[PDB]
Amino acid sequence: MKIYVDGREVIINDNERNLLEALKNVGIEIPNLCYLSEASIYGACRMCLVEINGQITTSCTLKPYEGMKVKTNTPEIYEMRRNILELILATHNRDCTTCDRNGSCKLQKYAEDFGIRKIRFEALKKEHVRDESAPVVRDTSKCILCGDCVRVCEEIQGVGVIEFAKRGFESVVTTAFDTPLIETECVLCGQCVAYCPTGALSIRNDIDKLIEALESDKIVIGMIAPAVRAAIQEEFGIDEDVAMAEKLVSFLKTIGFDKVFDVSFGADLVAYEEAHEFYERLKKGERLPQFTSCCPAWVKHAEHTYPQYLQNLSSVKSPQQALGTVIKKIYARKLGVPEEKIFLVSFMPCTAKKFEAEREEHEGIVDIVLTTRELAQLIKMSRIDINRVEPQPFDRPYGVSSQAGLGFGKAGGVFSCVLSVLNEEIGIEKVDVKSPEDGIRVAEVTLKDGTSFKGAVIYGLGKVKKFLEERKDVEIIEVMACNYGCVGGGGQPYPNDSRIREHRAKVLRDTMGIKSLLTPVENLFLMKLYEEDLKDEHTRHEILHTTYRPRRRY
Amino acid sequence: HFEKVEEILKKYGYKRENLIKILLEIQEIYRYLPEDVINYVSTAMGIPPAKIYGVATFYAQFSLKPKGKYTIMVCDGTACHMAGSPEVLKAIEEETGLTPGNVTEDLMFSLDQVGCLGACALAPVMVINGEVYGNLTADKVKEILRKIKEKERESA
Amino acid sequence: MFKNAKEFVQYANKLKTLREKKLNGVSIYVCVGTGCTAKGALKVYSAFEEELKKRNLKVTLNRTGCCGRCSSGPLVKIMPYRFFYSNVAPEDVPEIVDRTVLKGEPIERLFLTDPLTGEKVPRIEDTTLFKNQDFYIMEAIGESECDSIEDYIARSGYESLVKALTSMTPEEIIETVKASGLRGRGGGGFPTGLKWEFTRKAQGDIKFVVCNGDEGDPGAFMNRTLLERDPHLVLEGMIIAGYAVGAQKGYAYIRAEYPFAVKMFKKAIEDARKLGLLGENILGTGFSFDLEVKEGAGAFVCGEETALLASIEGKRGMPRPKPPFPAQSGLWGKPTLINNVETYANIPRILRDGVENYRKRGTENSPGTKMFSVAGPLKATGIIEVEFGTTLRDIIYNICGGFVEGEEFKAVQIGGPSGACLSEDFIDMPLDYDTLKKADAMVGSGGIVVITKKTCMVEVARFFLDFTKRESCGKCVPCREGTMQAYNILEKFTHGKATYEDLKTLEHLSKTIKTASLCGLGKTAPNPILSTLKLFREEYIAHIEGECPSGMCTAFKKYVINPDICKGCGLCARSCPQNAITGERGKPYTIDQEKCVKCGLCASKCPFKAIE
Ligand SMILES: Cc1cc2nc3c(=O)[nH]c(=O)nc-3n(C[C@H](O)[C@H](O)[C@H](O)COP(=O)(O)O)c2cc1C
Ligand code: SF4
Ligand code: SF4
Ligand code: SF4
Ligand code: SF4
Ligand code: SF4
Ligand code: SF4
Ligand code: SF4
Ligand code: FES
Ligand code: FES
Ligand code: FES
Ligand SMILES: [Zn+2]
């Protein structure tokens, strides 16, 4: 398949959907604003204009053919491309300094490259929507109406709370009747933010509160999620490492953190309690199938969609809330300090954890939740070369975890850790792992004393509806709202695509491989905590368990 | 609470591809599309409210605000526009103080621009609750609006 | 009529005899179409009905469709003695009854005045306007029942459908349509036969036939009139096409804001289903077909094929890049046939006649007639039908009677926002699909609107761009933002704030919108700007200079106090922000606009001495 591009021979692949993709594969780039994420579609920007047979048409919607002659850069195409970019920029809210995409915005880069230095059109007034009621922040004045967020929220997440509304110049992506996002069925997964190519969808920034807390005379305690340490290196343009968590601990100590703990300890704690709860349920055959509750986005989705299953949800709170409650109700007592003098910071890869920390059932435990991007911003603001910081371990007694507990950061980690706990408590004869579809895995598990069961690992909200409709034999279901689990969380470094998430999972697996402890019971600090401050089911329920209530609009 | 909405939906059988007709009939029942009705239709038909809201805001027939006791439709077709439809619009603005697509706080009047009404011989044209008023100038439309106001003042 | 052509033949012949009896007998025919209802046709029909029942008089009262004289008030036609009363009123109904139903003496004053000679012609059939027109689709004028399949059957209706079902195989139907030279009346002008070829050849045992009732113009109503006056002709064309392309289901897309057209089409579908012409079997041929009236929630963009299909499915009327064309994957990804109402109406006529007979009307490359709605200040307006060789001058003067006292021709719009503006040069040109394409114009969906000297071309362009930017679906950048920017520039032009930089920006933005827009709406969005600039540039230059050649741009309209109309009260001194009173005290005063900003504060305290 030979084609003449600007009058020179170019060989493209035989089977090609459109000319633009073929040219892209053979290394020829055509300026466009349609290919913006993995959830992108062609047809909207109209900037991919090419001239074939004396006529100008989009290359993204053009089937190539043998001997075809295409001109990619002509005075007419230059004029029209510049006109289209000027049209976009005329009504765009151009405040890059305070924008979250500043530095990684295709629109900003094109403005720089095309040499747009004055707005030849007029910034006609629009009825822009600005929403800040949720950890996911909306600003439609920066929106380019690419529609990626709509497709993500509907097809990938299966919620569909944001849609195109109105038409023409007043077209806008928004909730129904411009409802605040916190009052809708949004699960605050942040996938729309992970896919948005502009600052239209962003994450609530809470660095000011952290700085104010570190300035005051209270004890600031921090805790880092498993998946933060596997992705934070992306902002610094460096290779992965397994010492990232300890370098983060050293940096946090430098900027004035009294203690830094590992949320993997909370993951081990949660897996222990979850495994015991699930075993008791299997013994009595009550409230099955059991649903994991460590994903706050899935918990909110269940409260919105499956009010009948809220009893099937595990009563154990997520690792963040469990560890924070232990720190506030046991460690603070141990440290000889009032509970109100501790400022507990949580470093998470997730936007839904920000919502969880504010739930009326968890009010006050976690003071602020900062995402991987907010931690990377802190490091970059300090200008400290993180590639040269000497690593130091986490503070005692919540600075170590089993490899399974650290595995919570990728899909299937919590079910794996639960299986490890059960194997060390009873023993697993065999496990038969299947892959019914892309993001679903079902395991058939046999214990030593009979009583086999089936567990399922579902990552990617929206795969849940069909799975729960079409199956009734699983006993425990593990739901993670984000694809690949928490390594692809909404608060993770941008861009957040499938190959990035696979690499993050590989980095997390490498970091797991170097951990000496194998199972939560081998964690001597966890067992000490149990034997000392979590003896009876009363304190265990008060510290490690939460309740769920339905959500509906009226 | 919404018995007639259920009647409509069951007549159309909650079919997604009947959403436009469902919305039109619900509107003619309610004079507009209330948020509560849309939420209930969403839960009943298995569609998120955002999708229905987008469809409803895309089409001109639908309205998210209540129509007044007297609806004023001014034709903005080519013939009616060249006949002086903007003068009619200005007169209605100066008398009732409302822009097309809006309603008074009292819900007494509501204006809408519409396409050709097939009655180009009467350009500029205006329809008030089904009564066609043709060959309209500023004075005539002010006269009609006023007289409606007096008629409403006499039966209150 | 149910499952055999012979029974249908006896039924049709009986209905024909009843129609002949009714033609002989005294019958009242009231034009209840749009244009006549807005003038009081329903009330006149009620007046006839009440007077007939009150006097207890077998005279038949029937509702008929448009007769092409919508500007001439409600229309009434007395059958045994065709008189075509016009500008009828409900206060003269008893006079009509007593003096014509029984006595039969014509009422001269209620007759149709011909503008050429101003003489009351007894009938429209022997009127210059009727002679100038060429009726092929517009049939049984004034003597056709709209809400009855019985009259349609008595008028030799559905015979083409029956013969096609029983005689001609679908391939022969498609070949006849190809040879007939029928070209899409929706504006595209594409040959209907080739589209039918594509739809039939598409692989699949499930296909659909979709009828587009939209006018493709916010100023046209001819498709609505054709739907309202003879829905059964459209339905017959739809069924014939369904059999031709192997489709099993049909969809008529009529706007929900056309209550009469929707109700008439629903009634026609129901009747056809009661008579066996629609159902799980027709004439025992084994061909199944049903029709549904899909009500359009209202969107100019839904006149696009892909957007139309999206709206049929209950989604936003958003178009998409054409490949795959709807002929291969339309409704729910199935091969769909989409044609205009006029295109379907032309089908049963083509079947009834032959290829050659159809080709006799029109030109070589555009056989047949075309329906047009003519508006603007004009002696005779309404729906007209003419061959594809009639010039615009012929329509404007010989068929529409010319302009009314106080107006004269400046321009004409032939397709609405997507059409073109024709100056005095292009009206001596036959209306042909081929000829207009290289003259930078098009036939259009059928709309025509004359422009008089009291009109400003800049305002015409502003109006069309206002409509276009309100109707854009918002999907693609060129249309969504370029139309808004072009509208803003045109608004500046109409307010005397435009410079030559704005002229250049408008030209280049128009080219960008024309070439880069995804679908037809945006591609034709700058058509008014481009045509007006090509033929009326001097108007734009004058607006830049600071003066409107016409007087309709309200921006300037200087306010002057008439000295012969001024009482000379002397209250205008210090009463103005500009204080440019300069009015003699004790006598009439004069106002100077040298410092005035033209705010509109001169009619505050004066005896109507200020003119805006
Ligand atoms: C904005 C827009 C509006 C249109 N409106 C109509 C319409 O109202 N009626 C119509 O027949 N075609 C309309 N069309 C053209 C259709 O896309 C299509 O060509 C037509 O329905 C096919 O009918 P035909 O084969 O009889 O010409 C419109 C196109 C565009 C871009
Ligand atoms: S999205 Fe943000 S960074 Fe990109 S152009 Fe707009 S303001 Fe600038
Ligand atoms: S945060 Fe998740 S649920 Fe909320 S709008 Fe974005 S993708 Fe949808
Ligand atoms: S909010 Fe972002 S992802 Fe959604 S349409 Fe706008 S630019 Fe695209
Ligand atoms: S999968 Fe992980 S990152 Fe995603 S919403 Fe759930 S807890 Fe947050
Ligand atoms: S040209 Fe206009 S109507 Fe057509 S797809 Fe683009 S925005 Fe929508
Ligand atoms: S206020 Fe009016 S009427 Fe009186 S002197 Fe001035 S211009 Fe004349
Ligand atoms: S129109 Fe206004 S600014 Fe001009 S003279 Fe009258 S009051 Fe003064
Ligand atoms: S890549 Fe955007 S329209 Fe072609
Ligand atoms: S343009 Fe107004 S009625 Fe036709
Ligand atoms: S509708 Fe009455 S003459 Fe046309
Ligand atoms: Zn002007």
Numbering used by the authors:
A (entry chain A): 1 to 554
B (entry chain C): 4 to 159
C (entry chain B): 1 to 57, 70 to 624
Quote the authors verbatim.
The heterotrimeric [FeFe] hydrogenase, HydABC, from T. maritima is a soluble cytoplasmic enzyme involved in fermentation. It uses electrons from the one-electron carrier ferredoxin (E°′ ≈ −450 mV Schut and Adams, 2009), which is reduced during pyruvate metabolism, and the two-electron carrier NADH (E°′ ≈ −20 mV; Schut and Adams, 2009), produced during glucose metabolism, to reduce protons to hydrogen (E°′ ≈ −420 mV; Schut and Adams, 2009). The electron-bifurcating [FeFe] hydrogenase from Thermotoga maritima (HydABC) requires both NADH and ferredoxin to reduce protons generating hydrogen. Electron bifurcation is a fundamental energy conservation mechanism in nature in which two electrons from an intermediate-potential electron donor are split so that one is sent along a high-potential pathway to a high-potential acceptor and the other is sent along a low-potential pathway to a low-potential acceptor.
To further explore the particles without a bridge a further classification was used. It was possible to obtain a low-resolution map of a class where the HydB CT domain was found in an ‘open’ conformation. Fourier shell correlation (FSC) curves showing the resolution of (A, B) the ‘bridge closed’ maps, both reaching a resolution of 2.8 Å and (C), the ‘bridge open’ map, reaching a resolution of 2.7 Å (although note that the bridge is much less well resolved than the core in this particular map). We identified two conformations of a flexible iron–sulfur cluster domain: a ‘closed bridge’ and an ‘open bridge’ conformation, where a Zn2+ site may act as a ‘hinge’ allowing domain movement. Using symmetry expansion, we have also observed two conformations of the HydB-CT domain, a domain that is unique to and conserved in bifurcating hydrogenases, consistent with mechanistically relevant conformational changes.
